[PDB]
Design a protein around this ligand. Sequence first.
Ligand SMILES: NC(=O)c1ccc[n+]([C@@H]2O[C@H](COP(=O)([O-])OP(=O)(O)OC[C@H]3O[C@@H](n4cnc5c(N)ncnc54)[C@H](O)[C@@H]3O)[C@@H](O)[C@H]2O)c1
Ligand SMILES: NC(=O)c1ccc[n+]([C@@H]2O[C@H](COP(=O)([O-])OP(=O)(O)OC[C@H]3O[C@@H](n4cnc5c(N)ncnc54)[C@H](O)[C@@H]3O)[C@@H](O)[C@H]2O)c1
Lengths: 484, 484, 484, 484
Amino acid sequence: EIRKLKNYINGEWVESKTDQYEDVVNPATKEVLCQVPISTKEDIDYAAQTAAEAFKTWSKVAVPRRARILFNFQQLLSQHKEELAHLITIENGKNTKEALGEVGRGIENVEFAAGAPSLMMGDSLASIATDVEAANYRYPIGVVGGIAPFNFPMMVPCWMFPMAIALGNTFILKPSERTPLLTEKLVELFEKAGLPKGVFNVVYGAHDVVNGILEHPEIKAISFVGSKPVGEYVYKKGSENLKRVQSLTGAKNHTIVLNDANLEDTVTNIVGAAFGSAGERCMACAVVTVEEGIADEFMAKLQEKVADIKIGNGLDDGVFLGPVIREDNKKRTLSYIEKGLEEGARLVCDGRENVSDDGYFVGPTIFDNVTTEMTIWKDEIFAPVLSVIRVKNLKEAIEIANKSEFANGACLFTSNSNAIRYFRENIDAGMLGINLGVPAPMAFFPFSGWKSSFFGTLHANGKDSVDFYTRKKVVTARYPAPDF
Amino acid sequence: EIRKLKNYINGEWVESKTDQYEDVVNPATKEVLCQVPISTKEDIDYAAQTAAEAFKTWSKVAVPRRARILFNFQQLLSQHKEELAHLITIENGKNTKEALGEVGRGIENVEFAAGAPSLMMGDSLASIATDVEAANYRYPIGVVGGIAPFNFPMMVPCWMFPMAIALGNTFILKPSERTPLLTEKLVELFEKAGLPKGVFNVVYGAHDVVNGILEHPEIKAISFVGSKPVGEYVYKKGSENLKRVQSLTGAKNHTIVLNDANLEDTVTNIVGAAFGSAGERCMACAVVTVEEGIADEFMAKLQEKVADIKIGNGLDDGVFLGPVIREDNKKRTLSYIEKGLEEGARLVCDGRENVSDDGYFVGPTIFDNVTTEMTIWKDEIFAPVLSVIRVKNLKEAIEIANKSEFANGACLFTSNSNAIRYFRENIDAGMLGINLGVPAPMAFFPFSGWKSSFFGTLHANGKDSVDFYTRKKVVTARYPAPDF
Amino acid sequence: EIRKLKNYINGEWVESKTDQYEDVVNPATKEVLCQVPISTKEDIDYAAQTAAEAFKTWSKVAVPRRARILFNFQQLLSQHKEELAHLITIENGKNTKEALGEVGRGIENVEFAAGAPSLMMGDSLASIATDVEAANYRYPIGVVGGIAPFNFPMMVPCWMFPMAIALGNTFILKPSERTPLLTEKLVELFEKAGLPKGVFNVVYGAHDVVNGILEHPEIKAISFVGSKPVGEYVYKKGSENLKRVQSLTGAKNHTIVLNDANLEDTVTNIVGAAFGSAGERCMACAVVTVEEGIADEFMAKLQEKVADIKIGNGLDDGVFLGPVIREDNKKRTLSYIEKGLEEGARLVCDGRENVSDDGYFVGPTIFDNVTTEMTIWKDEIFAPVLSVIRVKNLKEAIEIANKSEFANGACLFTSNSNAIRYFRENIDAGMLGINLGVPAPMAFFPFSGWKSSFFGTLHANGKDSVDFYTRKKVVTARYPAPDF
Amino acid sequence: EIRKLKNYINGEWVESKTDQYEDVVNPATKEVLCQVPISTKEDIDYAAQTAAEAFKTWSKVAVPRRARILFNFQQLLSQHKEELAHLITIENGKNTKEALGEVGRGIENVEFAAGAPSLMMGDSLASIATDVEAANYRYPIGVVGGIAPFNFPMMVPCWMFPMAIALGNTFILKPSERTPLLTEKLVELFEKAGLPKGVFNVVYGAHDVVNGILEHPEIKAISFVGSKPVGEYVYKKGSENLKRVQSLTGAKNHTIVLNDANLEDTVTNIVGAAFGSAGERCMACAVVTVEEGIADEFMAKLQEKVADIKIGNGLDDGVFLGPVIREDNKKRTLSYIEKGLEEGARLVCDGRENVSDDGYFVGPTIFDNVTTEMTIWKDEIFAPVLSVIRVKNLKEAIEIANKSEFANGACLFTSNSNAIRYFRENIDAGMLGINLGVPAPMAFFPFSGWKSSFFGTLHANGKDSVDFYTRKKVVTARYPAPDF
Ligand SMILES: NC(=O)c1ccc[n+]([C@@H]2O[C@H](COP(=O)([O-])OP(=O)(O)OC[C@H]3O[C@@H](n4cnc5c(N)ncnc54)[C@H](O)[C@@H]3O)[C@@H](O)[C@H]2O)c1
Ligand SMILES: NC(=O)c1ccc[n+]([C@@H]2O[C@H](COP(=O)([O-])OP(=O)(O)OC[C@H]3O[C@@H](n4cnc5c(N)ncnc54)[C@H](O)[C@@H]3O)[C@@H](O)[C@H]2O)c1
């Protein structure tokens, strides 16, 4: 009665040779949507052998023709916005608006990758010496592996396979065993777009699959997006196996609010960056360092706004806050709230109260008087928990943000040019936002995090993704002028 | 009965204020398809005003949004390939195979342009001095004027308006008076794609409209694609009016055939480059300099292949060669064929014979023993008339081609590395082709012509079109580190 | 007694075949320094033919070898800063501090140009179609013509010949007949740097030489930097002759001082921009639009600082304001002050009072209460005359600057990010400065002006200069995979 | 008295705290040139602390100024080519001609690095959404560690520290313990060029120092150039320590000779690429796959010139082949020759005979009838030992070359464009040479190796080095237009 998902390998949906399956539920109602197979390394090998085979011909299809397919894909995605958004909500929990928002950014990724022909151009010189010319070209590297998180069932995957495939590589994706349904739709639409068999492969699962991706010698590159501990493991293991990898990991993003900040706009951006998507965002505002002069009014206006948050099913309109992903995560959050109180942090808003039990719901929570000594500051909670800290000025704010081991993003609310430059010059984070709650850059820019937030050389998206998914060859040739 | 075409201004089809209309006939059957208005300056003035007005809002639409529309446009264009090709054949005459080929390249222009976000990116430096940062940006210039020829009813217009619009400008297109229908379809499809009013304007006509575009102060840039005389004039008048302009003009492309050439491939290619589309292409092969050693065998296969060429209505299966555009062009050609004989050229193949009269037909013709002193060599016949010349070696071939006033394209059929380099380094033409009949570079490359074939600095297409349709603003800022 | 200057053609100093000569004096003492020949179209023909000949070998010296000579040049220049600055002061007037400043900028140009190898790189693709590859390359165009002004005897020329030479072209420079000594030194040092004969030619003179440059078919490109009337003239004439040209012309740069401006820095910056180098600068501040609130305090501080300006001989340390270039410019300036008083403007500082007669000295003068209807606002005084206007806000300020036909540079003094963005998006000028008196961008950025300040497509410096001094050839080739 | 070299930390030569010193001998005379310290952890710790401290001010020095110093450095280096070449020759063994060549290459690296300003430029967009702009910037990462091999005492180091320092980083270089003298001069010359203290540091030593670079937290990036085994270890340990690393390792470059090859040019190029610098070159030709047709004639010609090779002291004129680096290398090579004969290879040229004993000399050796199953083909001998293989066609040669574990460079001697494209499209090596023995690409191109020849994503040199020694921060800002 509960549909068992199948893997997509070499052009068709095949069943896994596994006896292990996992229930994927709707975070808001605990209803079982389907069953996800915990594929075996046996499935990963077949998928790898397949991708390596399809690579031989796909890589020979000229980039202009491949780009064409990305255009088709781009259009099919747009036509299915309502469906994709629906799948993201019932599976991830975020409401329709935020879900619809994810679909849009994932499409932007396809749009950016559709311009692959120009993105692949190498350098060329007519003469570097008498009768000698030189030019280098870009080539795909073979089969690429991708590992996706549950917080973005569509967007993160779109960061990887559209661009990698457009550049000539074949792909093996391991979506999040918690949010697999969306990827199933991507496959369908990418097949409709005209993508040939074995070019885009999907193997559902967990650890076995991951290790198979790390261990298989056919998979020359790895793009991992997820938690710090797992991403750090993937980076090391992958390097041990002598293959390039990029791991976009955890975050503990800080937002700096200065005295001259426009409170109206600020409070709204912050409430959304901290509580939207149940705070399950690598770009979620985890800590706010507000300047003394505006601190009092900020907390007053922050509480007011936070009091109007409707908690419920992401499908219902009026709903702002959905549920955390799993039961396990709800407990970890309540534990963190408990930990905060124990460490001396002051509860300004308690999300442990007035929450439905229909789903894994947790109301917004905000702590006051927190320090860099506390666990709720050092750890990425990844739930509706915002910590607030009063600072003397921009300098102290940055010292606190920089003290965090994570450096994904940071925000600054102000209209002061000098404050902005200083912020950008001394802040450790790599994805900065001025007067914006979520500092996530658009697809044509690399998603540049730093420190414990990023392991590797080249980030995802932007021209970085292009170079990470290709390798270069340089040709220096001597062609002596003929005699007549 | 006969539909009268209308102008497209401010998002709507409007009757020209003119009382003069021009019949648009099918070159292959002499029948009237419709009438195009010979619009007045009053019309061009209104278009400029509304285009200048639309520019105020359209330029304020972020490039990612404008680009999304180009993706829709790209799709609509693909779902109408057949209709578009049909239309091109009807008013131009080329068979549906070549027509289908033109529409594909026009779509490629849109595809290239859809990547406007990255193409527009300027340069940014965090510190050029202590406390000082600097960066430059690209902005649209305003209203762009475009004037297109008849040999490419879709492609040429697509080199212009999609990019200029994507980059943020508003456009006024004056298509060829002889092939107006295609442009009508573009307008309609771009409207369905979602382009707001006043951004894409079309004013049909001739001189009054062209001079209107050249004189009107609101039209900042002019893209002209046509004959050398007209283009030389547009460049000069445009420049006198102090506006930037690019004139892609006439050609007399030369094809070099060396002894090691692959006869089979070479002949098929040259036959296509010289007689496809009735030789009415800026990239058409006009002169061929064959190396002495392979000349005899070359001529044998060429004439053998030319004998298989079937002439007729482009819509009919089996038809290779179609009609020339107007009755006046048929006469000009027959006159050239005469001057050839009159100058000593040996008419090896006569195209004045076995030519139906249902349309303006002219069979493929080829002259022998032609020299650089003949009008047959110095002028662009722009019809199905090929001239051949026996040369001693690559060097003499290049000297002959370089002697030509034009320098649009040139081809070399060989497998010798040294010849190829020597060729590229010494030939004057900017668009080179090795073992290909038509050296037309793809959209993402600038259409680099030279000499009397190009007047200006930046060519059409490629990144050249990005800078031509855009201007820069650089900002050097000093933001002292605040006092703490 | 008075040394006559020669021209530098084909690596040799040859005397001009002219009877007419010109006195070149020291603006500060009327002391005659030497005699400049008003060369004839005969001299230019010699230069052009010489430059075209040498272009055959120079364009064949691989760019890496050419760049090496630029490095040597860069060093020689650096070793002669004192000498070069001495010449600039002696013939132009500006003090040694500003003169030293000019040599530094001129060396930056040489440094940027020394990176020509990477700047010339074109685009390459291994496969655009099965078995087909495509790449484009840049090549010099031939002999380039440079026409420089008197306000930057060293820098402006350095915007031209260094980059043009490095890219493969040969050069014919026509420095200002008013400041020709500096060029004499640049020629020597470039010769010592290792530059071969005929690559860098210098022809002193005026109209005859200009028209020779414009009319000679051998001179394929013209870079002009001077007044608007002449530039507008050279742009048209050059275009009539069908050659690419770029004219960087006159300016009436506006500076906006908002209420949050740091007056300390603002005043000092404006004083130096308005009166430095006798206001004889294309980046000089001719108009200040001050916000009403801080207007009075600004005027008291500006008036105070300006009255302290020391006028004298540029070599003399302690001297801020030097002399105006000629005697006419002195009279014309006096005439402008007189015009201002007549038009209703109010004097705050009378430049007519207390001024030596040893040289063409004019004290700094400042008007207030001027309007967009006064000749004092419409014309480029190009002398130490500064007009200020009180405005309600940033919006009114921008409207005023935008009303000028000139749009070279514009500056804004504020710390408000919203004001800064608004300024950049709506201002017409192309060279903007935030909290800087002179918005002159560094050599690696195009020197982008707009409207009556620039004529053409590509500006001087930056990658713009690279494209302006080169042309491209795209090569699309088909090399079928052999059978074995 | 033998001179003891010191370390260079904080702009000062300071004695190592170690008591372990290593003799540096002239490979050609066995004479002890000096003693190099085997530094301790304290020493690297000290350098790391110093470098990190200097980084705080060096990174704040705008790139245009930092580049100025690179121009000085470039000049100083050029005015010491002799002294530099001499040091290379007595320290490494290569004749002064090849030494002078290395000096030039190294100087090119500095020439390329001097263009840091433009190379560092990021992307900037005026509007990505209404009232929202975005742009990213490049910043140095901190302290960079470099480890160089003995075969290029100057060039390899110049691939690293010059660019790193120009990009704003600080550097800690560990040169080869066998060729420390060259580095000493680079340090001294860079100091004279004006480099501030702590920016360029040198710590001589072996394992303690290397492991210090790997383990120290202040060293964010590591550049390793050496053998596959050591490099593989550096990559893994480095990655394990969460720092980015690039390992340029061993090679077994093949050179393909087709029937249409030019024996004269080919043979010369191959003799130089196989026996130049005693074959101790990552770009040296280790295997030649000759086409049957020309095989015999090739071998005969190769014999002639190989026999004309003069062996001796690098400083002596007429000397072509110098000594191998050390005794072990001589023994390892002799041992390889033994294994060759032992495996079935025909010793066509024995370099064990007629070899002086003044230094570690080994005459040119060439094997025949070698196979993919032989040790002499699978291992990098890194000495003057050539292996030849007769193959039927290009395809088989590529299959053999691709079978090698290495893929640094590959050469192809032909004039057939079809073979050339096939070669580039199917060969595994990343640095290809057409009609050139040493396919080493110029500094402005990334030194792109592959397979077991490179570990990481970004190679050394080119724009790859710019991205490897740098990190990005993107800034998306919302600045609402103010209200007027
Ligand atoms: N290099 C290129 O990119 C390119 C591409 C296509 C065609 N062409 C050239 O175009 C020509 C064929 O096209 P065509 O016959 O339509 O060219 P044309 O110059 O006769 O007409 C082209 C445009 O110019 C306008 N025009 C013609 N005469 C005019 C006049 N006296 N005053 C003002 N406007 C005038 C027309 O209305 C038309 O829109 C050939 O010479 C061909 O080589 C060049
Ligand atoms: N925007 C820029 O890049 C820039 C930089 C420097 C100076 N300028 C402008 O230059 C002007 C000051 O320089 P200037 O006084 O030497 O300018 P100018 O126009 O008088 O002379 C500049 C060059 O033009 C030539 N020239 C002058 N009149 C001519 C005529 N009638 N016919 C032919 N050639 C003629 C001169 O010999 C000189 O080499 C100012 O208007 C200033 O704004 C612009």
